[PDB]
C-alpha cells in the first residue's frame, strides 16, 4: 500500500589516502535500485534491480553527471565542515544525507524528507513543511544561512512534491511484480532446552518482504517485552528478510506462551505455539 | 531519479 | 563519537547438511563506515566473498551484508570475523544454525 523512495549519500574523508570517497544508493521501499561509487574503476551509475534496466541511456548519463557533481560538492563541504568545527586536517570525517518522498496507499504525497548528519550526528534537516530548516548547532546555522540565500528549501519542495513522486510512481509501475508484492513470513516455533528447569522458545519469521514486521511473545495473553530477545531484522540476500524473537520459559509451561506475527503479506495476523 | 538541488554546506 | 558493530551470522535458506546454501554475515549499527569482514571455514578465510553496497539506517549507522555460497555439514565450522576502530581485537561470531 504505502511506498517510499530514498537516496542515501555518504562522503568520507581519508587524509593521506586520496580525496574523499562519495557513494550514493537509491531505494524504493526495501529494494535498492541504483548505486554510484567514486572509488569504482570507472565511476558511473549502475542498476541494482532488473526493473530499472529499461531506463534509456539519457537516464544513466544524467544520473552519473548528478552524482559526479555531488562528489565534488561533498568534497568541498567536508573541507567547509572541518573549518566550522575547528578540526585538524589529520582526522577522517563523514557527511551523510538522506532524502526522498513517502506516498500513502492512494499514491499521494504523505511527506518529504531531506536530512544530513556530520560524523553520525544530526546536522541539518528540512522540516515537514518543506519551507524551513532545523540546524543542530552554530556550525549548521552557517549552512542554513547559505541555503536560505540559495532558496534551497523551495527547490527541494518542488522536487519532493513533483519529480520525486512522479519517478516513484513510474518505478512502482515498472517494478509492480516485485515492488507491489508483499511476501508473507514463513513462521515456526523451535524449542531449545537451556537446562532441566528452562527452555528457549524461538519464534521465526523467514522469507518476508517488505522488512517491516511485528513479532511478539505473550505469556497468558500478556506481552513479554522485557523478557524477549528480539534480533534486528536481517536480509536473506534474495530480497527477503528474516527475524526471530525468543523467550526463556520454565519447563512444562510452554503452552502458556504464544507468538504473534503481523506483516503486510499475511491474509490475517498469526498466533503460533510450540507444537511438540 | 535524484534531485539536482546541489549546493555546498 | 563511535558505534560498534552488531553482528549476525546465518544462512539464507534453512540449513540442510549436504545441500548448497548461502552463508551471511550481517554487520550493522556501526560508525564510522570502515570495517573489515571475513567469512571463515574451519578458522580459514574464504575468498571470493561478495558484499552489498554501503547504506545506512535512520539513526545514520551503517550496515553491510557479506555473503558466500556454502554447503553446510555436521562437522564443518563456519564463522564471521569482524574488525572495526571500536574493537581492540577482531570479534569472531560462530554460525549456529539455531539462530
Residue numbers in the entry:
A (entry chain A): 1 to 276
B (entry chain C): 1 to 9
C (entry chain B): 1 to 99
From the paper:
The unclassified HLA‐B*35:05 in complex with the NY9 peptide had a Tm of 48°C, a value close to the one observed for HLA‐B*35:01 from the PY group. By contrast, the HLA‐B*35:05 allomorph has a Ser116 favoring the PΩ‐Tyr to dock in a similar position as observed in the HLA‐B*35:01 molecule. This is also consistent with the higher thermal stability observed for both HLA‐B*35:01 and HLA‐B*35:05 compared with HLA‐B*35:03, altogether suggesting that the unclassified HLA‐B*35:05 allomorph belongs to the PY group. Surprisingly, the analysis of the HLA‐B*35:05 structure revealed that the cleft was filled with a molecule of Bis‐Tris. Of note, out of the 300 different crystallization solutions screened for the HLA‐B*35:05‐NY9 complex, only three of them led to the formation of crystals, all containing Bis‐Tris. The small molecule of Bis‐Tris sits centrally in the cleft underneath the peptide interacting with P3‐Asp, P5‐Val, P6‐Ile and P7‐Tyr of the NY9 peptide, as well as with Asp114 and Tyr74 from the HLA‐B*35:05 molecule via a large network of hydrogen bonds and van der Walls contacts. A key characteristic of the HLA‐B*35:05 cleft that differs from the two other allomorphs studied here is the presence of a small residue in the D/E pockets that creates enough room for a small molecule to fit in the central part of the antigen‐binding cleft. This was also facilitated by the lack of secondary anchor residues of the NY9 peptide to bind to the HLA‐B*35 allomorphs, which would otherwise clash with the Bis‐Tris molecule. 32 The stability of the HLA‐B*35:05‐NY9 complex was moderately increased by 2.5°C in the presence of Bis‐Tris in solution (P = 0.0001, 95% CI −3.8 to −1.0, Tukey's honestly significant difference test), but not in the presence of nevirapine (P = 0.7864, 95% CI −2.03 to 0.82, Tukey's honestly significant difference test). 42 As the HLA‐B*35:05‐NY9 crystal structure revealed the presence of a small molecule such as Bis‐Tris, it is possible that other small molecules such as drugs could bind in the cleft.
The peptides are bound in the HLA antigen–binding cleft into six major pockets designated A through F. 9 Peptides are anchored to the cleft by two main anchor residues, the second residue at position 2 (P2) and the last residue of the peptide (PΩ), that bind into the B and F pocket, respectively. Currently, the classification of the HLA‐B35 family into two groups (PY and Px), in the context of HIV‐I infection, is based on their binding preference at the F pocket to specific C‐terminal anchor residues of the peptide (PΩ). 8 The selective difference is attributed to an amino acid polymorphism in the HLA heavy chain 116, with a small serine or a larger phenylalanine/tyrosine in the PY and Px groups, respectively, changing the size of the F pocket.
